[PDB]
């Protein structure tokens, strides 16, 4: 599980609410291509690949746009190229969750200058979620996750030796990512219910019930 392959995966794939949902649908296609470039993912059974992506797609995409936004002041950069300021998000009725992303993810990524290898490793940990329901062999996904965080810790110790707490600092952003992912899903289901926000085919499929 070499960190070089994980970094290569990141580099290979590099009403505001309506724009956000359009960017999210676009990035779902690219997310599948990213996962295929993480070591050993494509060797899992197809049903397990589906389970892992349906379980992690929203956290995976939130981590990505948050890190893309580190040089944006008080805003985010959509994958479509549109900058969205927090004033625009508040004026559209999603100010609270937008501020959570800025304060708990973007600003904290900026403050520690989280790099793209660390980002990719955190996303690979999220992808290899052994708690995902229905996996044919959870122990093998657990083993892949363990390989990722072992490689990440060694990377942090080699590249940032004067920061012994950095590995723990990276992992302790995952509870915030989990909570923000769940809250974003609540909003999307509500937009779907109200019907006043376009939702494209792949995003809509991710909002479908599982089989």
């Amino acid at each position: 599980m070499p960190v070089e392959r994980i970094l290569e995966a990141e580099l290979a794939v590099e009403d505001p609410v309506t724009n956000i949902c359009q960017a999210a649908d676009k990035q779902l296609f690219t997310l599948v291509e990213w996962a295929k470039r993480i070591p050993h993912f494509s060797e899992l059974p197809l049903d397990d690949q589906v389970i892992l992506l349906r379980a992690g797609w929203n956290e995976l995409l939130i981590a990505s746009f948050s890190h893309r936004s580190i040089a944006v002041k008080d805003g985010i950069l959509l994958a479509t190229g549109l900058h969205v300021h927090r004033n625009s998000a508040h004026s559209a009725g999603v100010g609270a969750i937008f501020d959570r992303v800025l304060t708990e993810l973007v600003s904290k990524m900026r403050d520690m200058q989280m790099d793209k290898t660390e980002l990719g490793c955190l996303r690979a940990i999220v992808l290899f979620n052994p708690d995902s329901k229905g996996l044919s062999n959870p122990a093998e996904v657990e083993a892949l996750r363990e390989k990722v965080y072992a490689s990440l810790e060694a990377y942090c110790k080699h590249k940032y030796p004067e920061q012994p707490g950095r590995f723990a600092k990276l992992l302790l952003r995952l509870p915030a990512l989990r909570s923000i992912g769940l809250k974003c899903l609540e909003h999307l289901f509500f937009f779907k219910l109200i019907g006043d926000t376009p939702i494209d085919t792949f995003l809509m499929e991710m909002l479908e019930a599982p089989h």
């Binding site: 296609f29 599948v32 295929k36 197809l46 690949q49 589906v50 992506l53 349906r54 085919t201 792949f202 499929e205 991710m206 479908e208 599982p210 089989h211």
Partner: peptide
Amino acid sequence: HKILHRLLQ
């Protein structure tokens, strides 16, 4: 899961 399966080929 139709789109997701097709993309995972």
